[PDB]
Amino acid sequence: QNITEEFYQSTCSAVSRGYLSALRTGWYTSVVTIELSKIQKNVCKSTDSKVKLIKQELERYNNAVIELQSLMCNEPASFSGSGSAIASGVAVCKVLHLEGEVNKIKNALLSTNKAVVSLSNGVSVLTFKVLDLKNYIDKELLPKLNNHDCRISNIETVIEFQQKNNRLLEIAREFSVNAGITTPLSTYMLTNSELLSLINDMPITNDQKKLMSSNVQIVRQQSYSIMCVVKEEVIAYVVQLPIYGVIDTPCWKLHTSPLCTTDNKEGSNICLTRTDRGWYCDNAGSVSFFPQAETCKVCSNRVFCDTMNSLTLPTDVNLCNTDIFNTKYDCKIMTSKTDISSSVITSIGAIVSCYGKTKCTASNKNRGIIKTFSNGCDYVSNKGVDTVSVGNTLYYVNKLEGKALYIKGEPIINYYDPLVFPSDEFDASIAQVNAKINQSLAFIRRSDEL
Amino acid sequence: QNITEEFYQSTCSAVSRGYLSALRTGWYTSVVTIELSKIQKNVCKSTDSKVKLIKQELERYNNAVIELQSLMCNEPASFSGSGSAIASGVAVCKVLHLEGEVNKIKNALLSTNKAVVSLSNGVSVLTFKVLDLKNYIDKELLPKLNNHDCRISNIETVIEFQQKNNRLLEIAREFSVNAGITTPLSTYMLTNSELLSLINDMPITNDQKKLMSSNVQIVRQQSYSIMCVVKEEVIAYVVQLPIYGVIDTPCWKLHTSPLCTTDNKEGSNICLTRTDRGWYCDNAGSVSFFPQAETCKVCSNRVFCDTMNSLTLPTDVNLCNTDIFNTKYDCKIMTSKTDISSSVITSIGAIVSCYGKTKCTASNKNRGIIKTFSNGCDYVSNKGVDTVSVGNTLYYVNKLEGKALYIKGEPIINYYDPLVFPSDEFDASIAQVNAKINQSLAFIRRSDEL
Amino acid sequence: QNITEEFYQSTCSAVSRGYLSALRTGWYTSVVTIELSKIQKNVCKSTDSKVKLIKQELERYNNAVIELQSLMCNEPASFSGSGSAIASGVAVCKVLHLEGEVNKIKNALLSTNKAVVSLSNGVSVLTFKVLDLKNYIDKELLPKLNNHDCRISNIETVIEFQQKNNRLLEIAREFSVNAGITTPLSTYMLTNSELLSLINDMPITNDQKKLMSSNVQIVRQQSYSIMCVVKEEVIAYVVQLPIYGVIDTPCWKLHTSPLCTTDNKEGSNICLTRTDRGWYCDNAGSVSFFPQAETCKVCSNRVFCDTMNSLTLPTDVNLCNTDIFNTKYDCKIMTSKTDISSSVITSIGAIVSCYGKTKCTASNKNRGIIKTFSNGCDYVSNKGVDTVSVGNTLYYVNKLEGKALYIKGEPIINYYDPLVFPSDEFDASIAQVNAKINQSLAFIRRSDEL
Ligand SMILES: *[C@@H]1O[C@H](CO)[C@@H](O)[C@H](O)[C@H]1NC(C)=O
Ligand SMILES: *[C@@H]1O[C@H](CO)[C@@H](O)[C@H](O)[C@H]1NC(C)=O
Ligand SMILES: *[C@@H]1O[C@H](CO)[C@@H](O)[C@H](O)[C@H]1NC(C)=O
């Protein structure tokens, strides 16, 4: 009733079921501002111990401003091809290159720290001001020093200026090594207290807000931070947040391992494996498939993915899990005579493909080995199991507890004849190999009757 | 006259033209030094609030010096195989393991911060001294504390010593997690003010200097920082800068998408796609091709790549863009019966390969959908277009404005017979498939005349 | 007698021998604790320059504690599939979700900073307390401020509190961007002085301790740091250390390059290359093979790898280096008609595959070019050589000095007939291609006798 899993002996593949979706659908674009107090090198050289320390701590304020301005060639019109997810925010970086749009933003920021601004393109973008140093320099630092005859207040304005400017240092220190775009969204670019404020104000239901509130760090993983322009005493940069629109549909992850024969001599055995491994979720009737599991993040029962790196597949694709020889969907597989033992760790278990003189075993935490694996594709539920060894490689099984079901079946590699079996197929399918069988056997059928 | 692009309907491929090259040709090697004032634990235990704070801030000065010395096994003679770009700087890390060469460098640094040094190998390497603490400890910190009866000046020498030593902390904090080699060149290893000083002094023309001056962050992306030795009160480490020698030649990026038929039943259709996708540039007559676009960085009109991860190709390779059936160059393609819809975002447009009941569309910012795609390979210019949907996947098109040209043609997948079409070819070519056609048809031609 | 290498002309492959193993065998799990002094917002608003600075420096102490608590969904039961190396530490993160186990740990930490704790699962895990702020706030910060009528001592308790809390900031600043698991083990999570203390106390021989002591940074590369729970004024997180069990066996790295013919017209030549390239080491009789060299780290004579990303292979696999046509082990190769020039840098040399009008050369540091390469697969020892050019690509050879041996032989690509040669084989073998030859020639043998 929580997290289940079923292993198919016929196909040497396992499916872990019970997960819930949270797919990235849109890009919540937003801009954060930093007020500035641009002053030139009018320094009064009263070389005192309380004056030079502010000279050092403000020269870093100078290196961390002109540096952001040189990063202007990213990205007005570059990034050809991939990485097209930031193009929803690059549309905002291009708006900030327009006169009057910069000024129209500084308006509603000097009175409430946050407000929605109407632009030239008109996109309803929110605005923030996370650090204000124009109001800390032109009111606290400039008047006591510029016209009051070079009067430094004390030493607590040197430590506080260090901590009020430390946030700006570690941002230019981060943007310069990232060509203007950072990911994940580091706490320097947005602390935890500020992010939870922006999520409550997104054009989304109260449901998705609770999700991104208790799962903060996952929102960071799939968020960006682009650098636009620096002009008119304002630092302008855009941060993209994921808009989860496909939520609460079921998900399941497919696990596959090679399935070979053990009734031949050395390399005279034949193998096959199901290709399309990874995460599958329901996305309005059709099935969204995520090949590289590197784009999906798992958090307890939740699965967060980006639909950009996904193949869209029809609902009739679940048939490969049971009846792989169905006429509606043609299931993809690969074939080879390469006979190598291997193991695959799943959600609540492990698949073992043992072939040859390989020492394949599953061991227990306390009493050592508990099951020696014979040759062939086998599976074991993690109940009481902790480690699995295959030759000189040892794996640990995730001790997430769940109900694992074994589905016995005739391994479909036996339904094939080794003579007319394809030597190697990269990404073939059931129909493509039965056609290649009907092709190689087409010569033997119509030539030996002489 | 600025940035153009042309789509070939015959080949289901698009070429974006108008870019300008900037290829990494050489490795400007350089060494940066740090003077040290090695003092032993002769601490006067006058446990005062202004004494223990310097004890803490100098114990970090101790952890961040002995730590760099343990990182000596990288890289005197390791790194077998790949990563051979640092071998121009490792040649300098091996020179610093020689007596007398270390001393000969400390000479011209205590009087001008920078000078060229003749070595034992003799490579004209430049030298820098970005942070001097031997002159800040043995002159400011040591005399007031060691022999003046444990006399701490004040508290401004605790904050300034914090900021004068903070740079050393975040370097050993970075080298220890990077095994002695960091990339990109972080501002900790070299700030913006110091890098722009070294570029003006490189054995290059005034042209490449302006390039690396307005495109600083890109130079960082393709730069390294190796750790050599720590001895004789000196921290020694080498930083490699890219020497761009192939500059201002034209470049173009190739985009490809599957091209299939829609005149058969389910999987009875045939597909083909052009393999060699990516960046191409002119490099002295021949064409330098960059397969993994991850090694190329785009900055407006400029394209920066590393010629180490490039295939060198003859000039007669541009023929695949137009006349793919040319006798001079044999164009590479792959074939498959896999019929999956997909989209490819280009520079100023998007290619759509729509097959089956897939919902393929291009949508507008304001008025929603503007063109439904039929089955087959199609292209759309980004003029007024903003998004493209393929099933459950949505892409954003780069709104870089340019002149896109459509080149209509007969899709070459129709010139093939589905019976004698290769089931799957990984990286074949026109000649290799016409030979395999002339092979499969060789049996049907000389056996049915009975 | 130190580092050797031999190139096989018959196979266009080189083997670098003389390296010594250090394979990751087990996971030394350990937990580090941080005592806390949880106080609520009972701040006395005596807005003084020495009071507000501690308010700022302690509000960061608040953001860096509640932030770690939201990262609780990683990883109680997630991470489906890959990344199963932390499951030895996740077993400890699951123990910390149990009442009484948290309290039983705080015992032996308030008196000796370190002791072994018996748990509910009972795993003998060590414990540490690297930073104590419960004893710095409830004894130094709380009594002077809470009940002594809001009395701030001085300003040296603001700088020291900055440096005593700076370590906690850059950890939550690192865990939040890493979803609770960081790698490599940064010095923030464990400084050099503390790591060398834990290695001396591992259930290992005195040998492996010296290894991980002079090779510290490599131990960091293959170590993790998981985040468990935050409760009862204690920060709990687990760090995994590698247990090297397979040590001091010989290792060798295989290098391969395409081997083609130069006796045909354009693409009428045939090529083949040995597939399984990378690191091989001895692991109890059998041979542990590491395909992706990205999992192996080289440090002088030592080679550190993780046996999780390794194929286990029989001892009879060294035969492919000499007699590739042996009956005991079937050597894997790939074939293609693609005739592209390329070079491969090895340990103490370089392999060059020169084909077509490609300009292939090896150049010297002083006197330029020293050997022009003819068409075919050739090798050169690094004695006096520094660079190798292939078309527009230039490589640097590692100037590690050693004894390179040339083993001349008949290139095995000539023993094949171009008519019945496979157009392309992804990962075939000698037997699989001789069978495909015995298949294509099976028709010509039994059909032309008419
Ligand atoms: C193979 O050919 C037979 C006729 O001999 C036919 O009945 C069968 O359906 C064919 N199979 C495929 C997969 O085309
Ligand atoms: C295929 O064979 C025919 C002869 O029947 C020949 O004219 C043609 O050039 C051949 N094509 C190839 C690609 O070899
Ligand atoms: C190929 O067939 C011949 C018989 O004509 C046999 O002697 C030889 O061993 C076979 N080779 C292979 C690799 O099967």
Residue numbers in the entry:
A (entry chain A), B (entry chain A), C (entry chain A): 26 to 105, 143 to 512
From the reporting publication:
Bovine respiratory syncytial virus (bRSV) is a member of the Paramyxoviridae family that is responsible for the majority of respiratory disease in cattle annually, resulting in considerable morbidity and losses approaching $1 billion per year. bRSV is genetically and antigenically related to human RSV (hRSV),2 which is responsible for over 3 million hospitalizations for severe respiratory illness in young children and the elderly each year and for which no licensed vaccine is available. The most potently neutralizing RSV antibodies identified thus far target the pre-fusion (pre-F) form of the RSV fusion (F) glycoprotein, a type I fusion machine comprising a trimer of disulfide-bonded F2 and F1 heterodimers, which is responsible for virus entry and membrane fusion. The pre-F form of RSV F is metastable and spontaneously undergoes structural rearrangements to the post-fusion (post-F) form, which no longer presents epitopes for many potently neutralizing antibodies. Here, we use a combination of structure-based design, antigenic characterization, and X-ray crystallography to translate human RSV F stabilization into the bovine context.
